[PDB]
Design a protein around this ligand. Structure first.
Ligand code: HEC
Ligand code: HEC
Ligand code: HEC
Ligand code: HEC
Ligand code: HEC
Ligand code: HEC
Ligand code: HEC
Ligand code: HEC
Ligand code: HEC
Ligand code: HEC
Ligand code: HEC
Ligand code: HEC
Ligand code: HEC
Lengths: 293, 293, 293, 293, 293
């Protein structure tokens, strides 16, 4: 069975354009019913049509959850980036598919993200905004949790050279200090960071990520005892997971978005002043003709 | 990961209008919860709504730290400049965003500040105070740490001409002599200035800025051994930082506020009589019709 | 950066009521510490509270250096003028703020001083002492180093008329002959005056002011080789300076206090018998009902 | 700037008890050095302590020049008047401070001198010497160069009545005939007096006073071409001067000491037999109980 | 100013031992030059040293004018009295200093002369010559021009008693008749005496003394039109003068030497046969043990 590391590993929901709508292009009759994309699930039984998507459609077709954020960026309080998302989906989050375990042999994982394109637009361009083209490039590699890596893909050669010279891909995240109790209560502390810096394939071994609270009478943010939040993540040490975060193409670092918005304030990560999560946008907003784009 | 040069490079806190308040316009439900600006983080889990701000709002929305200074100027002991700040935010500090490194190719950085406007107000005006309009103009440029620069922006043409003729933007700061010990103790000396004057992009290489003390039994100001101060800054030589200071539009010099208030007295910077930090206000308080405004 | 012409151009020290005292009304916590005027710099880190002062307070709040002179006048050997200084500060020295350069366009400078008030006190008063009221009036003007000037302010109309008719404000000082050597040694001669008489804005171009000695084995006063004195001043030809001296309201002449007390004796300024520095007190001690007060 | 009429108008030298001595009560450290009256100018830099003196001390503290005359009277060839000078300073010379000009409005000037006191000493005293008490009284007045005057002060009522009845104070001096050449040579003639008699405030307009020679091959006294003497005085028509001479309290006439000792012989002032300069001593040496003392 | 009655009232020339000689004990440097009695006026500027003399020196030190008469008596045609003058100066002329005026109150005047001493030299001496000792005694008094007088001094008691009994001191002189013309011509008549006999203090009111001629084509003595003689004296009615003559101690009469040698012949004073001027020598040449010496 698939294991959850940071995201629900429902390979159908993220790849098949919803399941509950009327026409439901992903739904088809079971035995001899209507052809694919024609049944009415509210009026007749029909089954998944085995639809799989590739390319930029997958980024856009991830609006099955996160309706609030999608509406927030599209004609909401995030109106600025509306042009980018409405044309390329979530064009700045990196999805890292991972396959199998047993660290004795070495796993296999690919990383998918976007890279701004700048070969056009009157060479010599050094603006504070990028041109609207991103090529949806990807990187995939194989290796053991310790030591060497082998790279492949169609990423820009400048990033491939950096990754080959480095020899590994690193993962860094911010670990808000937390206290775990017997009944599952998770309360955050006031001064603890324990900055993460490990190989990507050794990051599958540890699950000390804070990622919000779930307790009661907590002194930081949460106060309601009976809610369904998402506390500290799971280990998943030799399984098939979907690691989600952002990929800083400048240094080849896959960064996890470990803390949430209410837990990115000074009295909660004081020892380490920086939050690694917000680092992708420097590969978009301060570009020039060369660099690594 | 973002690097800290003089300011916390938390790109969300300075651009998203707080995160912990009740309504919390920057907070939105994670999967299908309340729309953006409607969750209660103390009563339900919700996530950053990807809100980004541009214009004069960003200057005003920087009241998430520095509550003491904001209250000091607004109806406090800094009551004089209350009219300016309450309408334009911190209208005299310059924020210099910087992107990427590897000085072989050259970085890219922009500078944001304010410039008094004087085209109105009965031509021939030569008062000791400026008119209340500042246009929040910006300058951005690209170049290597050594030699030539290329400029662009919407700054007044008089300043653009000076910057193009000069060919570079310089950084100057006051370096109070300090002694660094093994245990991190930093004690200031009695006579050492070592005035800074370097290209802006070569200022990212050196971190000899004094910027307060952190030791114990210090003979200058500090006496308490266990406090969390901010000692000498960090290098950040090929990273994405946020350099903060003031920009003197008269000479195109980006000035760092290197020493703090307790360390701007005669027995602490004696060899160099002037403190470069307090130089912005000459572009506001002694203006005339032309000049560089 | 600010330039030094005759005084340290530390715009905070002269305008913010000290920085090192316990309560330290000008000091405030950095991020969320105690409010302004409440931190203890010897026990906790806190920063300048952006306090700026206007009016008669600025004159009194200049006791951060010059403790010896302040104590000399207040209940010392200068006991006579103790009543005036303790109520109005240094009420006879003129401070001349100056802004920007490039003499092609023309600078902008204001002058601040005191003027005795005599409209009261039984009209017909022609005593040898003035009444204790001085109104702390100011004059500001704009113009190029050559030729015309434009005046404004709230000074008494009699002085404004004289300044407009004259068309310029002149600067005069006594230049004790000096010899400058390679190693910085400055020795005064026996007969050289070279009386100064130039427009105020052309006085920023030349720095031939003697202003004490710094050498060794000097035959005039100084004998110790290793001391920190203040030798001949600096040019500062297109910068923001703070010119300090006295303003003779009778002729509208801004007079620099060029020589010091040990160098105002006959064998050191013989060719010119008068010392222009001591000329302010004729606007206080020999007044009548009209005049220019 | 102050103007010289007959005396160096150095208001500090005559009022501040020297400047070059070791202890130097008038010298104080500049910024934070030793307190007033404690610096060593030959070993450390220190500045005028703003010391001002009033009363009989000012008369005694004028020994900073005129060392030869002071030693001549004190235990020298002027041994007779040694008792008077050692106790009251120069008790027979009159100092007349003057303030401002523009004769359209009228100036303001005070006169300071000594008056013998005779109310004691067995009424009926008509000796040829006065009693040793002089009260250092003063007279000050205001008026235009033409016509009326207004008097005030604490002088004996007998002199005040005479001055009010007269309506003006007159100045008289002896003008030795002189010839002035292009190169500054001044040679005295053999028969020319041109006795002076004018209002005090109209005496500031003319500068025909002989007051010694400065030429070469002169047939009267001087023979050396290269000396620094004091030739004919200056006009100073609307300025702040210090007129020095003697005040004959008998007639209220301020008398200038116009010619020097070598030029008070018969072949140099023949037309007028009397020299007005030596007229003060009749108010000391031939007094009685009443008179104007 | 001093007034001239019969003698130049130059109080310095008669009291300070010349001014033009090389060593010039009465001359001293002005500001810091050579000490008193050491300057060379022909080679350097120096000023009166305020030297005043008392005693028998003043009589001898009156050789600054009258060189002809001094040489006439000393080893000349007046060889007889050479012993007296060379040891006591002009020991038979009386000098009468006078002070102030306004005859309503009364003036004050002293008289200085010589009195032969005869208490020694074998009591019973009645020779035709006096012994060589004269004691340089003086008399001073106060009184109004009319009526009573008050006497004091150290004169011999016999003369004091006579003066007190008389109650006044009288002045007598011979008035040669003269005619005064518009152009200043003064011509003497042939028969007019108008003998003077008045109180000393009322003699200051009238100036009808002949005292030589100044005209042209005069029939008495003078023939040259252009000469500088000394015609009829001046009034000086309420001033400070120096009355010069001889004092006849026998009757206490101060006698003026009114006519000169060429005008003491019979056809010029015919009505009064005696000339009062030559009356002093009867107090020297016909003395005895008692009398009034
Ligand atoms: C349905 C279920 C979806 C779909 C179709 C997508 N997401 Fe999202 N996601 C989902 C859940 C329940 C959560 C909570 C995380 C948890 O339970 O542990 C998330 C979280 C994220 C995050 C935060 C990652 C982290 O905190 O470590 C991101 C960045 C994210 N999801 C992105 C994302 C994108 C880009 C999608 C479409 C391309 C997308 N999700 C779809 C549930 C669901
Ligand atoms: C939250 C965290 C913020 C926010 C939202 C702003 N600042 Fe400020 N700032 C912050 C810290 C922790 C510090 C300490 C500096 C350090 O840790 O090294 C500062 C400092 C400054 C300074 C001093 C710069 C220097 O000493 O070199 C300035 C001038 C400053 N901050 C300005 C500033 C402005 C103008 C802001 C809003 C527009 C602002 N800050 C927001 C923390 C925080
Ligand atoms: C701290 C630093 C101060 C403060 C707060 C004031 N002064 Fe003063 N001042 C200071 C220095 C180091 C010097 C030396 C001058 C030099 O380095 O070149 C001075 C000098 C003066 C002078 C002399 C001016 C001259 O010689 O040309 C004056 C007249 C003077 N300072 C006046 C003054 C007044 C009136 C102040 C308060 C209102 C004042 N100072 C404050 C240093 C400092
Ligand atoms: C220092 C400089 C002093 C001081 C402290 C005093 N005097 Fe004197 N004085 C000085 C100079 C250089 C001169 C020359 C005059 C000139 O340059 O024109 C004088 C002159 C006088 C005179 C003569 C006045 C005349 O000729 O018209 C007098 C009477 C005089 N000075 C008096 C005087 C007194 C009474 C002082 C102390 C109370 C005194 N001076 C101080 C220079 C200096
Ligand atoms: C310099 C000037 C002197 C000095 C130092 C003395 N005298 Fe003499 N004197 C002087 C003048 C110019 C005149 C002319 C008189 C005039 O101008 O009206 C005189 C006159 C006399 C007289 C005659 C008095 C008379 O005619 O009424 C006498 C008796 C006399 N002078 C005496 C005298 C004595 C005793 C002196 C020294 C002790 C002396 N003089 C000095 C000019 C000068
Ligand atoms: C929550 C999101 C999400 C989930 C869950 C997910 N994917 Fe994807 N997948 C993506 C996105 C986004 C892309 C876009 C890659 C591109 O556009 O090039 C992608 C692309 C792919 C590709 C294309 C690779 C290529 O070279 O074209 C494959 C294969 C794939 N996914 C397999 C899987 C499998 C197998 C699972 C589950 C068992 C899975 N994915 C689950 C988001 C997801
Ligand atoms: C993957 C690309 C990408 C990333 C990552 C990204 N942006 Fe942008 N951003 C854009 C583009 C494209 C635009 C211009 C949109 C347009 O012109 O329509 C833009 C515009 C903006 C603007 C407005 C610029 C203007 O001139 O008005 C702001 C502000 C901004 N972004 C902030 C941010 C911040 C803050 C981050 C990171 C926290 C970020 N962006 C991350 C692509 C990106
Ligand atoms: C502590 C303050 C601060 C931080 C941190 C900060 N900014 Fe800004 N930023 C500002 C201010 C102030 C402005 C105002 C510029 C204006 O008003 O024109 C601004 C403006 C901008 C703009 C607008 C440029 C334009 O032309 O309109 C962009 C893009 C931007 N920031 C990007 C970023 C990114 C990306 C980060 C972090 C990864 C970041 N900023 C972090 C203060 C900050
Ligand atoms: C970016 C613009 C700006 C800067 C920088 C600035 N000021 Fe001002 N200042 C103003 C304005 C605008 C006013 C007038 C406010 C009003 O009229 O309401 C003012 C007013 C003042 C006043 C009061 C003037 C009066 O007539 O009462 C003082 C004092 C003052 N400033 C001091 C300073 C000092 C000191 C500095 C530098 C250390 C400084 N200011 C920097 C904009 C500025
Ligand atoms: C050493 C002394 C000193 C220094 C340094 C100094 N000032 Fe001042 N300043 C004064 C004094 C004194 C006044 C008093 C004026 C008054 O009372 O009217 C004053 C007044 C002012 C005013 C008030 C003008 C008005 O019309 O009310 C302004 C604005 C000002 N200063 C600006 C500055 C600036 C900007 C700087 C430095 C960058 C500076 N000053 C540095 C002494 C100083
Ligand atoms: C700006 C005004 C001002 C200036 C400039 C000034 N004074 Fe004064 N001075 C005063 C006042 C006011 C008093 C009277 C103080 C009192 O009555 O309490 C005074 C009093 C005096 C007194 C004592 C007067 C008395 O009757 O006892 C002396 C002496 C004196 N000043 C000397 C000087 C000298 C010397 C100077 C110049 C070198 C000078 N002053 C400059 C204002 C001034
Ligand atoms: C060369 C001598 C000299 C000079 C120069 C001089 N004074 Fe005086 N001053 C005196 C003397 C002597 C007195 C003594 C008055 C007394 O004792 O009553 C005096 C007294 C005074 C007084 C006291 C008035 C009173 O009523 O008590 C004042 C005020 C004064 N001076 C002002 C000045 C000023 C202002 C200057 C120059 C700008 C100056 N003086 C220059 C010699 C001088
Ligand atoms: C032309 C001659 C002459 C002139 C002019 C003159 N004196 Fe004298 N004075 C004398 C003589 C002679 C004595 C000698 C008295 C004695 O020896 O006792 C004398 C003595 C004195 C004495 C001494 C009195 C005593 O009791 O010892 C005084 C005082 C005096 N004079 C004052 C003056 C004054 C004041 C002036 C002018 C302003 C003046 N004199 C002008 C000739 C003169």
């Amino acid at each position: 069975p698939p294991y959850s590391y940071n995201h629900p590993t429902n390979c159908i929901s993220c790849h098949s354009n919803s399941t509950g709508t009327a026409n439901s292009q992903a739904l088809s009759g079971l035995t001899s019913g209507p052809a694919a994309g024609a049944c009415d699930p509210s009026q007749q039984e029909c089954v998944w049509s085995h639809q799989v998507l590739k390319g930029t459609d997958v980024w856009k077709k991830c609006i099955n959850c996160h309706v609030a954020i999608w509406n927030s960026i599209n004609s909401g309080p995030g109106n600025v980036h509306s042009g980018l998302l409405n044309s390329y989906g979530c064009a700045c989050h990196a999805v890292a598919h991972v396959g199998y375990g047993n660290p004795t042999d070495g796993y296999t994982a690919c990383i998918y993200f976007y890279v701004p394109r700048l070969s056009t637009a009157t060479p010599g361009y050094f603006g504070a905004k990028p041109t609207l083209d991103f090529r949806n490039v990807y990187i995939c590699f194989k290796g053991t949790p310790e030591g060497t890596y082998t790279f492949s893909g169609n990423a820009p050669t400048s990033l491939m050279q950096l990754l080959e010279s480095k020899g590994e891909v690193t993962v860094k995240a911010l670990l808000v200090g937390y206290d775990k109790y017997a009944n599952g209560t998770v309360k955050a502390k006031s001064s603890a960071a324990d900055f993460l810096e490990t190989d990507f394939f050794s990051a599958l071994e540890q699950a000390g990520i804070f990622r919000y609270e779930w307790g009661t009478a907590s002194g930081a943010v949460l106060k309601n005892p009976s809610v369904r939040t998402h506390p500290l993540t799971e280990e998943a040490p030799n399984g098939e997971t979907i690691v989600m975060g952002v990929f800083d193409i400048h240094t080849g670092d896959f960064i996890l978005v470990a803390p949430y918005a209410p837990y990115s304030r000074a009295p909660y990560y004081l020892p380490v002043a920086v939050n690694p999560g917000v680092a992708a946008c420097f590969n978009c907003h301060f570009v020039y003709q060369g660099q690594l784009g």
